Symmetry: C3
Subunit: 171 residues, 3 copies
Amino acid sequence: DLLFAQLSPEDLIEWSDYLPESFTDRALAQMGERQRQRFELYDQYSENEIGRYTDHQMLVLSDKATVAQAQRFFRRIELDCNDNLFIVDEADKYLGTVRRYDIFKHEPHEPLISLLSEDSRALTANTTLLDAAEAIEHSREIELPVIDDAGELIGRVTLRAATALVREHYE
Amino acid sequence: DLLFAQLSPEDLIEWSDYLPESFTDRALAQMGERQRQRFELYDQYSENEIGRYTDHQMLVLSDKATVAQAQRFFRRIELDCNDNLFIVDEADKYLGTVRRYDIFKHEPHEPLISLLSEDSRALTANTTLLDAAEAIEHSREIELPVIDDAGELIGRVTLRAATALVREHYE
Amino acid sequence: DLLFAQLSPEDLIEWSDYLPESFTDRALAQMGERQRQRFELYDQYSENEIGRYTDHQMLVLSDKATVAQAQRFFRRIELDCNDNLFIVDEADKYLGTVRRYDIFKHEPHEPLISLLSEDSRALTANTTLLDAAEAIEHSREIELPVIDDAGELIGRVTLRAATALVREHYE
Ligand SMILES: [Cl-]
Ligand SMILES: [Cl-]
Ligand SMILES: [Cl-]
Ligand SMILES: [Cl-]
Ligand SMILES: [Cl-]
Ligand SMILES: [Cl-]
């Protein structure tokens, strides 16, 4: 019957003018790392920025990875709305996307940096929720990467999440 | 069948002369945040100081909150022995207590800082266990706030806990 | 159906050339402290060093402890392959081992530092896996302490673990 188990990170954000920082910190310490992550996003991104609903869970590899690593990633992990994998450089800058279907057609020794999809777009974290939902919905993608204003890949948004956003903005 | 799951934070305190700090730290890292909190209190407050049995779980709001926030706090959280809410300033200094019964009689736009109970007492963390138990038992309160020697609200003690303390000091 | 719940700390190590540090850090933050410990060992010790398979779970006391503490440790904790307890100085340097059977024959007021077993060996963390397994198997011990190159007791290896290592190095 616990207290901090009864408050969401969103509650904390919404009540940031009224709760002592001490209380917020004890709440954060008692929550899951996933919930702390949600709090940091809500704290950085306002209610109509897609950054706020970004999911850090994703398939990502550095620009040193090969087809062999990508194939193994897709085979070893089960993830909702996933059929792409994101490539970053050593400063975490998003470089591009490789697709599952294409990467099972290449040789395993091939660097992923040489097989980046020509179609691949990323959302900026400041994109509006409805522009985000449109961008995923009217494409052939089931997820899109999200980058911050420094170019760093911070996470992804899924087609499933876009559906929620839309249905929210009806109700 | 785990080891650090078999040792309480109290065990660690009691054995602080005999366990390497390295062992204590690994134990603390493996425990829940609630258990780490218990350890810090036992580490700071000796066996006959009420600080040691202080509960950080409480209804608290800053002096910027209104009746509207207080009403919503009481309605959204279920907490043992709770019918008061504590107001602190921006340096976390305890200012006073508002009671549930009174705050459901005021207008929601009213600042809590203007409705502090005249009756409201706080225990100092160094109060003896039996003086603490008496103070809660022979009052009309079911909980009291505890402050440190800097004036900061560090937590509360409940009527239920006081009962335990008493029954302990019989046995 | 979570992602970081699907990757072991060993996976992370094996894929350290290919995952962004950002991804590794989020994975580590989401895992248990035990799993983070496993990662630090794999990160420090290579595949044929016993340090890598060291268990931090152990009975250890400082050189200020008495027989009374040791007796109580053995009686209050259930631990796999355990019938020894390790004594360290205040800088965590391994000094020696006391055995359960012997310490139940001494007076409780006696300092453990005066009852160190003459037989007691420790493995260096760089010992090969098969030399480690041999050392435990062909002795009268069911566990051995492991020390780092600074002399610090970092953990233990059990007879059970040695069996695994052997059976691994067959298959
Ligand atoms: Cl691989
Ligand atoms: Cl695998
Ligand atoms: Cl409110
Ligand atoms: Cl609510
Ligand atoms: Cl003892
Ligand atoms: Cl005990």
